[PDB]
Each structure stands twice: as C-alpha cells, then as structure tokens.
C-alpha cells in the first residue's frame, strides 16, 4: 500500500532564489534554499493523492515555520526560538490532490544555521495533516545566513610573548576581525633566541562551547596547520605570515546564541624545538560573513 | 591587481645579529667507559663533556666523571621539584648482576655501549629543557666534579 498522501512544499520564488550548502556528519553536503532575517517565506503545500478510491479523514491541516536549536542529539532538549503557524484547512476529508497557499510576512530569523558536534541550529517549514492516531508530517529545510558589514573598530593584534631567558617573540596579525574569505597578514619577530627551533606553524582552531554555567562542554577541532617557518632563526629575524581563510571554509563566530552555545575561532601560534618540545600562544579572532555588495 | 602581495613592514636585521654566532649552542657527550674498583665494589664511569654559550651555565666548557647512580640521582631530584615530565633512563639492569651468566654481566661491551648511548640520549633532552635549566641539580650534575 505505502502512504495514502504525500506532502510537497514549493516556494513561490523556487527558480530565482539562491541555494546554499551545509557540511553534515561523515562528509555529506546538503543543499537548501537560502534566507535572510526579515525575508517573507511563501509558497504552496501540494498534497498528491496516491490511493484513488480511498479517503483521508483529518482534524485539520497546518503549516509552521520553525527555527530551533538541538543539543546532544536529544529530542527532549530541542528549543524552538521561532514558531509561526498558518492553518490551511478545517477538519474535513480529502479524496483527490489539492494545493494550499501560505505566506509568512517578514519572518524574523535571528540566528545563522549551524551543524556541529553537540549542537544543531536549523530552520524548516513543517506541514502537519492531523489524523485520529498518527499525523502525516513533512519537514522542508532552509539555510539562513546572517550578514554583517565592515566593523567600526578593527585593531591589529600585537603582543610580546616568551619563555624567560630562552625565547622572546613579538607576533602581529593585521586585524582582530576577519571575513570568511579574508587573509591573515602578519609577522613574527625574534627578540631573543636561546633555543634550537625546528619549525613554527600557525593553526586555526575552532571551539564549540555548549551548555550553561558549570554545565559546559567544549569540542575543539584544529581546522588548519600552516607552517610559517622552517629552521632556527636568530634575533632580529622577521617572518612573514600570509594565511588565506578561503582554503578552509570556516563558519562565522557565533557568541552565546540563544544563551545555549558558542562557536569561536583562535589563531594558535606553535613553535617546536629540536627535541620536539612545543611552545604556543592562542589568540581569538572574530570571523564574520561579509554582506555582498 | 592580479596577486595579493601584502606583507607587514619589517625592521632590517642588524648585521651583528645576522652574522654573529647563534646563542643556542649546547652539546653534551657521554663517552669513554672505565671500570673503577676491583672485585665486588666495581662500577662503570663515563666522561660527561659539555660545550655551551648559554649564560645560565657557569662554565663554557667542562669535563666530569659520572656513575649510573648519579644519573638516577639527577632524575629523582628533577621529578620532585622541577614539574618537568622527565624522560626515561636506559634502565636498571638487575638480572645482569646475577652470577654465572653467559656474558660479562654488567661489564658486557654491547651492554655498556647501549647504556652509554642511552645516557647521552637522556642528558641532552634534560639539559636542553627550559624549566630544567633553572634547577640547581643539573648544574651540580654537569659541571661540579663531584655531586
């Protein structure tokens, strides 16, 4: 037999609208329609009737726009931050195929869609045909990106760090805030060198902080290891950095989203000496999604 | 523009720094095994010969004689105060001291060779470590002629 009815959602701007991609578990790449905070969502719910002869008794049909955050793969932890409802039909019957119009006016979408380890933030349309014991339910996913402009203030990061009477260095990155296809332009400057350095590298590190207060879990992932020096420098030696972020497709920094989770990026400078001892300093950088002109 | 050739401005290196000798020189050689004593109280000693230009060490060159217990004494001193996860020694070989083996026991040439190389392996890792150079036991071990 199969199903009696199949629900299909089709957006009014389903040809012209731009789509986007999402990396999910084990390398899979989904593709869904892209939306922005403030945009109206509208289209059609199309019920295809599959068993001609039979009839479908229901106690209402609705469509919902939903944006929600899911934690630790646990259904009971899901929190909807946006829910809108449109009732499409009163309790009735369906004998044949039919379609319904819906429009959500100027929909608030305060957060950017994200898929991580312990956190998912996703938007979707959900159609529900209510029945006596089991509802027919159809989800229809959407990407939402959040845009920004060039920041008012964007100070360079500049600091002296070291190991007293072994290694003193001064590092500098050209900005604090980099867009997703920006370039880390920087330099390392050696003021005192009394160890034998094998190589130096710059690492881009992504931290996913979940939970509230002492209930805090941090998932770390090293997105890039970029060697910037090979060999033992002496004092007065400068080392240029030019690290293109386009090569690593990172997500924006996301800070205390709905007071539930954070995603933060760090530049971890690492020197390694001849006996494999490893000296490091970590600096946060805000990544942001640049509004195209 | 076809290429992003951006770099930060760099200060020219002073020529005395460019060409002057580097300030990270440190090599320690464990060498020349000798038997001290006769009969029951015999033990092997090795010449620990250092060369350096680091200002924390008192002598730029030194030569001293050490025992395998002196290496064990150093490792126990560092494990307590230093908070440096210390690398291992080549091993206390108790079963070689037992009598009537099919080799010369603790005075076997292949044993002494491998032991000797393991001491050099140990002492270079420890003496190059930043936090270990602050401890007085390392300078006592390397450069005072008796501990």
């Amino acid at each position: 037999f199969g199903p009696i009815c199949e629900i299909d959602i089709v957006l009014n701007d389903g040809e012209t609208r731009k789509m986007a991609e999402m990396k999910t578990e084990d390398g899979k790449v989904e593709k869904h329609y892209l939306f922005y905070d403030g945009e109206s969502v509208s289209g059609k719910v199309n019920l295809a009737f599959k068993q001609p002869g039979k009839r479908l008794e229901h106690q209402g049909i609705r469509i919902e726009f939903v944006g929600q955050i899911e934690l630790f793969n646990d259904k009971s932890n899901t929190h909807e931050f946006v829910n809108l409802v449109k009732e499409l039909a009163l309790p009735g019957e369906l004998t044949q195929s039919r379609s319904y119009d819906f429009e959500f006016m100027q929909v608030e979408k305060p957060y950017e869609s994200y898929i991580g380890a312990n956190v998912r933030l996703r938007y979707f349309l959900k159609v529900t045909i209510v029945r006596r014991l089991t509802d027919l339910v159809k989800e229809y996913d959407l990407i939402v990106h959040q845009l920004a402009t060039y920041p008012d203030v964007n100070n360079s990061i500049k600091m002296e760090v070291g190991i007293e009477d072994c290694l003193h260095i001064e590092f500098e990155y050209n900005k604090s805030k980099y867009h997703l296809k920006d370039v880390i332009v920087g330099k390392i400057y050696f003021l005192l060198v009394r160890i034998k350095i094998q190589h130096m590298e710059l690492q881009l590190i992504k931290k996913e902080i979940t939970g509230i207060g002492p209930s805090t879990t941090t998932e770390t992932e090293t997105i890039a290891k970029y060697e910037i020096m090979d060999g033992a420098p002496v004092k007065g030696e400068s080392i240029p950095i030019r690290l293109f972020l386009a090569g690593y497709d990172p997500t924006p920094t996301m800070r205390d989203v709905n007071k539930k989770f954070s995603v933060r990026y760090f530049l971890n400078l690492v020197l390694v000496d001849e006996e494999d001892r490893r000296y490091f300093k970590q600096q946060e950088i805000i990544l942001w999604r640049k509004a195209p002109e | 523009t076809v290429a992003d050739t951006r770099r930060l401005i760099t200060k020219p290196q002073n020529l005395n720094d460019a060409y002057g000798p580097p300030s990270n020189f440190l090599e320690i050689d464990v060498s020349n095994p000798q038997t001290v004593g006769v009969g029951r109280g015999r033990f092997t000693t090795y010449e620990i010969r250092v060369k350096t230009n680091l200002p924390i060490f008192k002598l730029k060159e030194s030569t001293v004689r050490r025992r395998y217990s002196d290496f064990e004494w150093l490792r126990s001193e560092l494990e307590r105060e230093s908070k440096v996860v210390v690398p291992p020694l080549p091993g206390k070989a108790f079963l070689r001291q037992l009598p009537f083996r099919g080799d010369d026991g603790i005075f076997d040439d292949n044993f002494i060779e491998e032991r000797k190389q393991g001491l050099e392996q140990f002492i270079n890792k420890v003496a190059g470590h930043p936090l270990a150079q602050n401890e007085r036991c390392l300078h006592m071990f390397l450069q005072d002629e008796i501990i």
């Binding site: 760090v161 070291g162 003193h168 001892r277 | -």
Partner: peptide, 15 residues
C-alpha cells in the same frame, strides 16, 4: 606525550 608550554606575556619590558 608531547610537552606543551604556554608562552607568557611580557609586561613593560623593552628591547
């Protein structure tokens, strides 16, 4: 296994 060492900040110290 690998010995990590955080590089300390240096305050009001010139070269």
């Amino acid at each position: 296994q690998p010995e990590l060492y955080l590089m300390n900040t240096m305050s009001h110290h010139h070269h």
